[PDB]
Amino acid sequence: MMIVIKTAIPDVLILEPKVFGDERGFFFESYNQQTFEELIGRKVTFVQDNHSKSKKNVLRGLHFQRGENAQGKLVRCAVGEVFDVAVDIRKESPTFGQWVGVNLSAENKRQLWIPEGFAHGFVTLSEYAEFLYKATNYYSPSSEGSILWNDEAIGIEWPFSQLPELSAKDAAAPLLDQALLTE
Amino acid sequence: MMIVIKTAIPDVLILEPKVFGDERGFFFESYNQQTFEELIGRKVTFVQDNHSKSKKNVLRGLHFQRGENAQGKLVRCAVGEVFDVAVDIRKESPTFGQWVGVNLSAENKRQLWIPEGFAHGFVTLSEYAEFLYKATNYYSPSSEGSILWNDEAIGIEWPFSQLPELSAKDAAAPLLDQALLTE
């Protein structure tokens, strides 16, 4: 079964499959369309599944897509562990600029549902981590959007002390205010 | 580029996604609705994702669902390696009783598309293997059917050298001529 836990930000949900641990190994339903729509309360279609691998300390993110390319993301960690983050970037939201951080691992099986209107990011905590994520809309480069990981306005408390290994693109990400200029 | 390979049985396809990166840092699209639909030529919706873990030699299978609960399955291996099998069980099909076997591993990133009308099964080749599934219809206990792994009429050539480990339920599966292929 799956336990659904709300986070400090209402629309962001943690899903936790409680799994067997049998003799052959285990087996669980990681996603179920009818169930998920009933949980969220509205129709939701995932059109794209992605799978990525990263080394310890690689931080990916604070990504989002604008307007009609806005993507809802249901993510989890197939291998290792990451510290996942969701930032509410809806200017009209009571929780705008607020963030939620959750540890997702192959062991705990947690998932994080991040609706459209949020930016996402995560850091690899284990030697390597394999991240899976489903999206409500296709990734389209022309729509990309990013926010610097250590932006003070948001003030995420990242579990690490070292500087994260960032991609050239994420290291050059603008601060919250700039980032949302035309949004 | 992304490669789609046809097997000896027409409707069964092997998919090998476009991977960006190394053995130590990558990213790929494991499913894309519009692309898949164009490939298959008809509309297809996956309503359920499954995730399993199995020890070496655990063989799961020769499962299918009857009539309206018939499922199409897109499967891949996120961890380790398995030998995956699809058996055509459409009584009116020119390839009825025929099978296709493909090695799917975390490394090769191959996926097998198994349409409605086929039974499915696989054996774990690595110490452990984590298998991921996407189905076009929900599991249905009433509609489920199974076929014994070593059924002679089908005659699958299982790669393993050792006896497989089966769940009580699969060890008790009937032989093809006894399977309830239709509702």
Q: Looking at residue A146, which CATH number applies to its domain?
A: 2.60.120.10
Residue A126: C-alpha distances to residues A82, A130, B25, B26, B166 (Å): 7, 10, 14, 16, 33
Could you list the residues of A known to form a binding site for substrate, using ranges. 24, 29, 48-50, 60, 73, 120, 144, 169
Nearest to A32 by CA among B137, B64, B49, B153: B49
Is A133 marked active-site?
yes
CA–CA separation, A51 and A59 (whole Å): 15
Q: Given an 8 Å threshold on Cβ–Cβ distance, is A24 in contact with B55?
A: yes
Q: Residue B118 — left, alpha, or beta (φ > 0 → left; ψ -120 to 50 → alpha)?
A: beta
Burial of A114 (0-12, 13-18, 19+ CB in 10 A): buried
In contact, A162 and A57? CB cutoff 8 Å = yes
- For the annotated catalytic residues of B, the residue numbers are 63, 133
Q: For strands B59-65 and B144-146, give the pairing.
A: antiparallel
Q: Which residue in chain A has the smallest CA separation from B124?
A: A24
- The 3 state secondary structure assigned to A25-62 is EEEEEEEEHHHHHHHHCCCCCCCEEEEEEEECCEEEEE
Q: Given an 8 Å threshold on Cβ–Cβ distance, is A48 in contact with B60?
A: no
Residue B127: C-alpha distances to residues B53, B54, B56 (Å): 11, 9, 5
- DSSP secondary structure string, chain A? -EEEEE-SSTT-EEEEE-----SSEEEEEEEEHHHHHHHHSS-----EEEEEEEETTBEEEEEEE-GGG---EEEEEEESEEEEEEEE--TTSTTTT-EEEEEEETTT--EEEE-TTEEEEEEE-SSEEEEEEEESS---GGGEEE--TT-TTT----S-SSPPB--HHHHTPPPHHHHTTT-
Catalytic residue among A31, A133, A138, A139: A133
Is A63 marked active-site?
yes
Q: Which residue in chain A has the smallest CA separation from B51?
A: A28
β-pair partners for A27: B52
Q: Given an 8 Å threshold on Cβ–Cβ distance, is B52 in contact with A25?
A: yes
* Domain span including residue B120: 1-183
The number of folded domains in chain B is 1
In contact, A106 and A77? CB cutoff 8 Å = yes
Query: Does the annotation flag B120 for ligand binding?
Result: yes
C-alpha dihedral, A90 to A96 to A102 to A106, nearest 10°: 10
- Method of elucidation: X-ray
In contact, A135 and A50? CB cutoff 8 Å = yes
In contact, B127 and B43? CB cutoff 8 Å = no
CA–CA separation, A148 and A176 (whole Å): 7
